[PDB]
Amino acid sequence: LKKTTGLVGLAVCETPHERLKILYTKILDVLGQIPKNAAYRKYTEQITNEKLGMVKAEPDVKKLEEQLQGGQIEEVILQAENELSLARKMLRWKPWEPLVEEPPANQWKWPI
Amino acid sequence: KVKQDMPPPGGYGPIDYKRNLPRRGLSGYSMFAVGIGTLLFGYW
Amino acid sequence: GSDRSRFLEGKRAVEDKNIGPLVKTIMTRCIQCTRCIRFASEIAGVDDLGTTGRGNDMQVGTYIEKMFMSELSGNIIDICPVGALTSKPYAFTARPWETRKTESIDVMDAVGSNIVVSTRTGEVMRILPRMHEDINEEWISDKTR
Amino acid sequence: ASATRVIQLLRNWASGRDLQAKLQLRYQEISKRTQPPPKLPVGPSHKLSNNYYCTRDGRREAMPPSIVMSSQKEKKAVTPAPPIKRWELSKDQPYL
Amino acid sequence: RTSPTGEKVTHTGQAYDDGDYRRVRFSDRQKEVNENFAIDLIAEQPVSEVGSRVISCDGGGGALGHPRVYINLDKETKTGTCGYCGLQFRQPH
Amino acid sequence: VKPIFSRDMNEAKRRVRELYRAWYREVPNTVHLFQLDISVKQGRDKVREMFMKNAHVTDPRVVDLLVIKGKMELEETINVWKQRTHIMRFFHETEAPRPTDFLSKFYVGHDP
Amino acid sequence: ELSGEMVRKCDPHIGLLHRGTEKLIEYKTYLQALPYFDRLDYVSMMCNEQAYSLAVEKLLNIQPPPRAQWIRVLFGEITRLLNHIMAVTTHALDIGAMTPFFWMFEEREKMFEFYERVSGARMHAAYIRPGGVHQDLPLGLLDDIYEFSKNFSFRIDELEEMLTNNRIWRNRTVDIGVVTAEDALNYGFSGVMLRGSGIQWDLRKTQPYDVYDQVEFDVPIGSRGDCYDRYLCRVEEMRQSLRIISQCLNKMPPGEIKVDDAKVSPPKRAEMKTSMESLIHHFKLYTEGYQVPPGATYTAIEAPKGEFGVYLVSDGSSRPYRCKIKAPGFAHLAGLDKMSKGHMLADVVAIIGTQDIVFGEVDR
Amino acid sequence: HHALIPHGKGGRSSVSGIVATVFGATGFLGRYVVNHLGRMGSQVIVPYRCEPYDTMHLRPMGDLGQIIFMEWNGKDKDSIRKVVEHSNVVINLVGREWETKNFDFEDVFVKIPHAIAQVSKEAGVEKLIHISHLNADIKSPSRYLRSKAVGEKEVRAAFPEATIIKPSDIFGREDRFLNYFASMRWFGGVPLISLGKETVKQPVYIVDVSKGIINAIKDPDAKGKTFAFVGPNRYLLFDLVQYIFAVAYRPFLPYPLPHFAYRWVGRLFEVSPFEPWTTRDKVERVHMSDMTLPHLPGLEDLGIQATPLELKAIEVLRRHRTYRWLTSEMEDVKPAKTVN
Amino acid sequence: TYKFVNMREPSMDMKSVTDRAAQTLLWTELVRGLGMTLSYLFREPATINYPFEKGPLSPRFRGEHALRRYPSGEERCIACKLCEAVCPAQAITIEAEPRADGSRRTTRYDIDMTKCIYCGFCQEACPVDAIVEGPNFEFSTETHEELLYNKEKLLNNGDKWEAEIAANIQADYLYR
Amino acid sequence: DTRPTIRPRNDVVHKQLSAFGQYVAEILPKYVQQVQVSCFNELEIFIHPDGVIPVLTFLRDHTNAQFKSLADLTAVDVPTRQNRFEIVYNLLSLRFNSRIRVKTYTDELTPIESSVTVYKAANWYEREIWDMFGVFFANHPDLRRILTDYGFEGHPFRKDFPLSGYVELRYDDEVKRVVAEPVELAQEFRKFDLNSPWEAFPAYRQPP
Amino acid sequence: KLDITTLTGVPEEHIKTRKVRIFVPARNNMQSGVNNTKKWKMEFDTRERWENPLMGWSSTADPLSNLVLTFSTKEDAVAFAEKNGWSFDVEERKVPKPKSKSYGANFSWNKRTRVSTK
Numbered sequence A: 001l002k003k004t005t006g007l008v009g010l011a012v013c014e015t016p017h018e019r020l021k022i023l024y025t026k027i028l029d030v031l032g033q034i035p036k037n038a039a040y041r042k043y044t045e046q047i048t049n050e051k052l053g054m055v056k057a058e059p060d061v062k063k064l065e066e067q068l069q070g071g072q073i074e075e076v077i078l079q080a081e082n083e084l085s086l087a088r089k090m091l092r093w094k095p096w097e098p099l100v101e102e103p104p105a106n107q108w109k110w111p112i
Numbered sequence B: 001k002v003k004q005d006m007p008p009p010g011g012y013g014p015i016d017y018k019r020n021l022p023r024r025g026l027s028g029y030s031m032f033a034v035g036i037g038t039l040l041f042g043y044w
Numbered sequence C: 001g002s003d004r005s006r007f008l009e010g011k012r013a014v015e016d017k018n019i020g021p022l023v024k025t026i027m028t029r030c031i032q033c034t035r036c037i038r039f040a041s042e043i044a045g046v047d048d049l050g051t052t053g054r055g056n057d058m059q060v061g062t063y064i065e066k067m068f069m070s071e072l073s074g075n076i077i078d079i080c081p082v083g084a085l086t087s088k089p090y091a092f093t094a095r096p097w098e099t100r101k102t103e104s105i106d107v108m109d110a111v112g113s114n115i116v117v118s119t120r121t122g123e124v125m126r127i128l129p130r131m132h133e134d135i136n137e138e139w140i141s142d143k144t145r
Numbered sequence D: 001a002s003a004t005r006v007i008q009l010l011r012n013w014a015s016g017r018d019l020q021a022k023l024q025l026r027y028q029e030i031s032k033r034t035q036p037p038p039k040l041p042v043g044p045s046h047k048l049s050n051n052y053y054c055t056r057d058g059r060r061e062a063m064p065p066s067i068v069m070s071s072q073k074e075k076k077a078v079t080p081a082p083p084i085k086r087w088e089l090s091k092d093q094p095y096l
Numbered sequence E: 001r002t003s004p005t006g007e008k009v010t011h012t013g014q015a016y017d018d019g020d021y022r023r024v025r026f027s028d029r030q031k032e033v034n035e036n037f038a039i040d041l042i043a044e045q046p047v048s049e050v051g052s053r054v055i056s057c058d059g060g061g062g063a064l065g066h067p068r069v070y071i072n073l074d075k076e077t078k079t080g081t082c083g084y085c086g087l088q089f090r091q092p093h
Numbered sequence F: 001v002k003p004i005f006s007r008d009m010n011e012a013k014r015r016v017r018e019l020y021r022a023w024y025r026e027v028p029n030t031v032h033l034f035q036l037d038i039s040v041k042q043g044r045d046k047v048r049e050m051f052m053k054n055a056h057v058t059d060p061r062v063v064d065l066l067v068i069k070g071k072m073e074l075e076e077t078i079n080v081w082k083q084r085t086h087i088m089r090f091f092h093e094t095e096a097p098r099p100t101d102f103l104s105k106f107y108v109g110h111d112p
Numbered sequence G: 001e002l003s004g005e006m007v008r009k010c011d012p013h014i015g016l017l018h019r020g021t022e023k024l025i026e027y028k029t030y031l032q033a034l035p036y037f038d039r040l041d042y043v044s045m046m047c048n049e050q051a052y053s054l055a056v057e058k059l060l061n062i063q064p065p066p067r068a069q070w071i072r073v074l075f076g077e078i079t080r081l082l083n084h085i086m087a088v089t090t091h092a093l094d095i096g097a098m099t100p101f102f103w104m105f106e107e108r109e110k111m112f113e114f115y116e117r118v119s120g121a122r123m124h125a126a127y128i129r130p131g132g133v134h135q136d137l138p139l140g141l142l143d144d145i146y147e148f149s150k151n152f153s154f155r156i157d158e159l160e161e162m163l164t165n166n167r168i169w170r171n172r173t174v175d176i177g178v179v180t181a182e183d184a185l186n187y188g189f190s191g192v193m194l195r196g197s198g199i200q201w202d203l204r205k206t207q208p209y210d211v212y213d214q215v216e217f218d219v220p221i222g223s224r225g226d227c228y229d230r231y232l233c234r235v236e237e238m239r240q241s242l243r244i245i246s247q248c249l250n251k252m253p254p255g256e257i258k259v260d261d262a263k264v265s266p267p268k269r270a271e272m273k274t275s276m277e278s279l280i281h282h283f284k285l286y287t288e289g290y291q292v293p294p295g296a297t298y299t300a301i302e303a304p305k306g307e308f309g310v311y312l313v314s315d316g317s318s319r320p321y322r323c324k325i326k327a328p329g330f331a332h333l334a335g336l337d338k339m340s341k342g343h344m345l346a347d348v349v350a351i352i353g354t355q356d357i358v359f360g361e362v363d364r
Numbered sequence H: 001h002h003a004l005i006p007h008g009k010g011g012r013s014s015v016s017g018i019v020a021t022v023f024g025a026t027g028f029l030g031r032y033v034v035n036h037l038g039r040m041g042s043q044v045i046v047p048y049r050c051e052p053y054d055t056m057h058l059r060p061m062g063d064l065g066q067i068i069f070m071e072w073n074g075k076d077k078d079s080i081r082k083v084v085e086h087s088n089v090v091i092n093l094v095g096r097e098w099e100t101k102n103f104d105f106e107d108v109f110v111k112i113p114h115a116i117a118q119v120s121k122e123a124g125v126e127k128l129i130h131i132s133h134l135n136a137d138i139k140s141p142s143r144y145l146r147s148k149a150v151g152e153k154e155v156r157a158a159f160p161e162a163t164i165i166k167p168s169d170i171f172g173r174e175d176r177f178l179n180y181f182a183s184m185r186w187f188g189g190v191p192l193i194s195l196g197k198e199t200v201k202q203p204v205y206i207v208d209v210s211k212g213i214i215n216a217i218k219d220p221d222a223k224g225k226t227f228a229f230v231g232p233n234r235y236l237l238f239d240l241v242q243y244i245f246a247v248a249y250r251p252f253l254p255y256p257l258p259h260f261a262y263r264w265v266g267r268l269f270e271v272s273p274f275e276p277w278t279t280r281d282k283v284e285r286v287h288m289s290d291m292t293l294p295h296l297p298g299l300e301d302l303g304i305q306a307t308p309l310e311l312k313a314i315e316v317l318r319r320h321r322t323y324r325w326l327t328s329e330m331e332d333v334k335p336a337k338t339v340n
Numbered sequence I: 001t002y003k004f005v006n007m008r009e010p011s012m013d014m015k016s017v018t019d020r021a022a023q024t025l026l027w028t029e030l031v032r033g034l035g036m037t038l039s040y041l042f043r044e045p046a047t048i049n050y051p052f053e054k055g056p057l058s059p060r061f062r063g064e065h066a067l068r069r070y071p072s073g074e075e076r077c078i079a080c081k082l083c084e085a086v087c088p089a090q091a092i093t094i095e096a097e098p099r100a101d102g103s104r105r106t107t108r109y110d111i112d113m114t115k116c117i118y119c120g121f122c123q124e125a126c127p128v129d130a131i132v133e134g135p136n137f138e139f140s141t142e143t144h145e146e147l148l149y150n151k152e153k154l155l156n157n158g159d160k161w162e163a164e165i166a167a168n169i170q171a172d173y174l175y176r
Numbered sequence J: 001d002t003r004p005t006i007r008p009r010n011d012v013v014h015k016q017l018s019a020f021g022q023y024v025a026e027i028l029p030k031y032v033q034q035v036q037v038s039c040f041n042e043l044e045i046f047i048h049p050d051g052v053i054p055v056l057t058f059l060r061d062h063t064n065a066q067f068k069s070l071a072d073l074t075a076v077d078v079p080t081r082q083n084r085f086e087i088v089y090n091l092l093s094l095r096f097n098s099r100i101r102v103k104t105y106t107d108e109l110t111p112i113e114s115s116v117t118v119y120k121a122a123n124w125y126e127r128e129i130w131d132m133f134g135v136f137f138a139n140h141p142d143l144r145r146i147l148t149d150y151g152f153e154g155h156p157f158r159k160d161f162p163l164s165g166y167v168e169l170r171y172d173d174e175v176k177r178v179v180a181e182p183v184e185l186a187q188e189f190r191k192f193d194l195n196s197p198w199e200a201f202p203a204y205r206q207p208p
Numbered sequence K: 001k002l003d004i005t006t007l008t009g010v011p012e013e014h015i016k017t018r019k020v021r022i023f024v025p026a027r028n029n030m031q032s033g034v035n036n037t038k039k040w041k042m043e044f045d046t047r048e049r050w051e052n053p054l055m056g057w058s059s060t061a062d063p064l065s066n067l068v069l070t071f072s073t074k075e076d077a078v079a080f081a082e083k084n085g086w087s088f089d090v091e092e093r094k095v096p097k098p099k100s101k102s103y104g105a106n107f108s109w110n111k112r113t114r115v116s117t118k
Ligand SMILES: NC(=O)C1=CN([C@@H]2O[C@H](COP(=O)(O)OP(=O)(O)OC[C@H]3O[C@@H](n4cnc5c(N)ncnc54)[C@H](OP(=O)(O)O)[C@@H]3O)[C@@H](O)[C@H]2O)C=CC1
Pocket: H023, H024, H025, H026, H027, H028, H029, H030, H048, H049, H050, H074, H092, H093, H094, H095, H096, H097, H103, H108, H131, H132, H133, H134, H166, H167, H168, H169, H170, H171, H177
């Protein structure tokens, strides 16, 4: 097994595949709680499905890390946790709704 | 002709940039033996 | 324009012409734009300025040693783009970037010409016209200036 | 340096290295303080022909930023850039 | 020169008047005055004669002087004067 | 417009009173800790004076911001982040009295 | 707040050196604002010039000449040696090791006259300007730099002899101020404060500038995030700088040291005193300066203390509208309380030193 | 001849046209007179006979070039000439409470004043401000007050239009009156003649005296007037000293010492070649009750309202307290009884 | 492309463990550092005997300012005022009038050395090599007022250091 | 153009940044108002001031946007707008080796949600923005003066704040303390009018 | 109405006694360029500038003597002046008249526009 993740504060996970699968399934459920036409749901579902398929395809940890291109597998697990938290927050924010308000006249004009 | 400040033809010599902290002293066995021998001579 | 010069030859030099006690003339800087001639002949009615010679030797200024006497002579200093015609009283006193511009009104005559008082460190360095199409257009008198 | 052989040997043993080789003080290897006059070269634009500034005005070839989306009147997910390639361990001294 | 108060006058003509309190700064000290009035030093330089109708002065030394300017020598009543250097030139007459 | 802390001037006035109580009860400590050479009345009157300067304010957002700055000033005084120099800056002493009468102003200088 | 000598709370009060540089820059032309950056990080001067120069050149849409870039990197790494010597020795000086301070500051003196021989100033050279550098290298300077860098390796090894394996130094630094990789990124740490926790990130490798993509060097990476690992990174960075310096001393190319655009960089004095066009531009560049096209940019470099960034805003005139300066030590000092949790008073002294903080840049 | 138009806002970088030569500015009152002059933007000329080091505290009081230091000799009128030559105002504060080896009360309170007044007329100085003592009597028990009266007449003879100021007992941070009584704790009790029940004093704050001098210069009517600067309250000596030991939180032990014994003690402290801790004239002056002169204008006529001692006594005597009573406020101690 | 500092496990051989225990007990690395500083004791110190020995300097050194004159003896300053315009500290104050000869000569050229940043921008902007930061760096004064240089101070400075200033210009002007 | 004087332009990064800007705008249309890519390959996303926390949290946590490092957080004072203060966020993505900018606006009174919960570095940056400009950040753990003096009044980095300020310090011998007094300058800061009367860049010409 | 005066920190003397002028700067008559006459500017009223006794430098006690704020339109400048409680004085922008110019008039047959020299 890997002795250390290299990064300080990041511990080696003895079960990376199972944890990744669980996190991806949770992310997919939370996205399924989101309206379909929203771009966030579509994009995140595509990314999560790709990553979950890659996880299921390769049992080798190092080959899976190389295929994911997300760094070490523990970094991938942390990314999945952050994505799950982001999806849960976006469920409350609901950014798929139209723009709150247009900028007031010449608000983004440069130079003066 | 142009007379800028330029490296000599062929470049400069090799510059050392790695640590060279050498190895010094005797082994632990030898140092302990010397100490114990001095202690025994003092005791006698 | 470009950022360098290909002119490897020797530049010309033009003898200065004295045209009065107000307009300091360094004619080597003249670019023969004929602004002063037209201004005199039209706005001032004084047909004294003109070009003498032809080619690269053409020189602007009165052919004889004559003084350009007019109440509006001071404006040939402003119209001239190059420093060929410059204010003798204002000569060497200050640079434009340091002067503070205060927009005011002239009181020398009853025309009420709009002027700019160029001050620097609490001192009036010069007076310049301020554009007002309905009063003085772009000119001021010699007294006002 | 003006150090005797005994002092030099003591210094080298205490340091554990040959100090008389890489002396920190400078004696003669420095460059002369009166160097010959130079002759610096001109840049790539010091030519008398085919050198109009419009063909080399970098300052005027900048443009206002291109607007990609304005709120005012299946796509694949896109990253800001390709993911960074994992670094490779050094081959001079991989472990210090 | 010396002002009536006994104070040396600078090349700019500045000299504290007797009715000026600012002169007290020189009581136990000196007044820094340069003793090489440039206006006197240049007028000492002779007027060079050059047969050509237009000459150019760079102040001497080439790149160690001033920008090169060309001076007309047509006026026989006066002498062409360099704007930077102050040197005078005259066409032989 | 979106409020800062209060939606009504009555709510804003409540925070002003709360700040005044904190300021009023701090003055005895400020004189004691900073070893000021003034009386407790002078400090408490000074607090009243500074409050009365911002008495014409009617916008609740400005009132909240003034209280926010008021709490920040109090925190520095309580934590002795300010010094005796900072505390005594309210009591302008080295400044000469500037008369507000026209004839007095006319005599002094060109001040409009 | 101390409970005995345990640090319950650590509250940094800054602004005692806040001189209003960012406001003063708005009233001065782009050339006049260059010396201001020398005073931001007054331990690493020419690096600050390079970051400002790159930001202006990016807005100017110009490119410095090839020789100037190599000079910016040669003196960029000599500047790194200046800072890391100050960073390590003064850190050790505050711990109690006073001797290595004097050993390395003699080498720091030798590098100071490298600044002086090329610009005329020992610290604030104002040498790296937008468009390249100010003057070409004086004859014989490269040889003297080689002579210094030839023997500078022994000086670092002497420094390591006194600190690296000393059990007292390790007791003062090992497991002190440990920063996790995740916290370092969130808290905005950069430079050694990141690579000391194992994060593989160097702005000279990932986002190279000037000719940093043509030099070869190794990025030292820590493993525990404590003060000792960051001490090893800075010591190794000094050794890697000598690796870069040797390449710069052999790959120096012929050519001019200023962009050949007289509307940005002033012409030569020989050209200024002979060419009408050159005198006009020299007159305008030193009175009004060059106008920068309107826009904004955030240009950041791998300064010795971390990422040094400048958010330059141009309104189209010859004076910058807004110049926000990103000090690497500004974010590092913000996390001082986070790092100094459960540590004694003596450990905070170590933690302050290991963050490599100069308050000129912190209090812009 | 030296007339200057004031310019600015009266701040540090302003111009006030009050170019002055403050003699004896290296002293308790001098510091405040210079500081008040300096903050207005006045060209202050500071003559000094001491080491430039002792004059260092006067340097930050004025802007660049507004404080000129130049040495002077009290026995050399020529040195006086070069320091008052370009001054439109001359202020005389030269005065020592003890006779020295080379300077006696006559030399400091008669000869020097006369020399300053005489030379100022020669140089054309417009206004002169002389500082005498409220209790200046031609037949006073103390030689200090004796010479202070002779010099007062001589100044008016040499300089007819000269403002003469007679402060009572100036008190302040560097004062030799409030600190004098507070320093008597080291000698055990507090020796007072008749237990300080037969002496009335009316001390004046240092700031008020300094502002009175500045207002006298600004006032165009002060020429030739004789002012008397006194405090707003009159205290018995016993009551004042008890209040001094009250805000200082020191044990007050007053014992009556006969006049001959107190004079004998004063003679003993005169032996010290350095500044004496007390003097026979110092004893007589302290025991002498302050005169009342309602026929002379005071601080009130100059626009400055005198500050009561109660408000500004905490500043002086806080340094005389122990660690126990350092943070105590200025309101805990009740004001002493005033004989008004 | 990256290197691992630390990250070096120790060998647990009995010989290696004994060597480490000997290092711990007999303080081998402490004696090593002691020998290092003892070796530094017998080195030649790098001190220079100031003021009898002065540190190395270069012709480009930026020190006390000075107004130079033409070989003729006349001031080079023609009051173009761009040295004042380029000064980032606004230390230079210039006033000029047409002199009695009619030339461009300054009536006031005041630089406060107490505000100057010794940048050199002034000597680099001057088109006639008039203002030049000379080689002098030891001109400390006991009062603030002495650092507010007049035109007379600068002119006097230039006349004093001309020989050296000229030599430095001649040595360095080809790089400018 | 080409040749050494001009700065080379990289089209690949321009295309990538434009694509990612479109991506962000699609994902967050509720707050994103405008997206720009400068010619020197810098991406800017313009966000309604209520979108500070959502957009930043997305750009920090999203798998396709790992801007986990807050490079900078500054404000720009443009007093010619209703919302003069322009808050700029500079982010760094170590995963994709790129940077992004987020710009919002606020008045002198309307507060801005504090991004401390998103980035812990935003603490001192928001404190500095408040101290220098006066922008208030709601839900901020500790908002107070960071760079100015303790008793300082006014926000200096505002465009309408004088360069020399309103007050100055000195030591007074009477009060035995450093005292603040209205600013008086021995020499006034000489304001220079440097802008040339001729248009320099025709590509930025505003409509008449 | 915005009354940010209590938040700007400006002393009372520089809020009420001031007189802000809002104007488009006039074209520098020495040049034909008009690029500077495109944005509205805001400046305060000139005050005393006395002479420093030591050096003759022009001293001042006006902190707002160098403030020149640039605005895109007149309305924005007026709003900003109203925000800080400054007594503004707006001057209407002056635009040069469109002028009928004909080169052929220089050689008129029966008109005074006929020029005598070129
Ligand atoms: N409470 C009081 O102190 C009162 C004092 N006065 C009088 O008013 C003036 C106030 O001065 P004060 O603050 O007491 O001064 P100090 O006693 O504190 O210091 C005396 C000052 O006079 C100078 N001086 C004294 N003797 C000589 C001398 N022989 N030659 C030159 N200089 C001399 C000293 O200069 P240096 O330090 O160099 O010796 C110093 O500046 C004095 O004349 C004082 O007698 C009147 C009423 C009350």
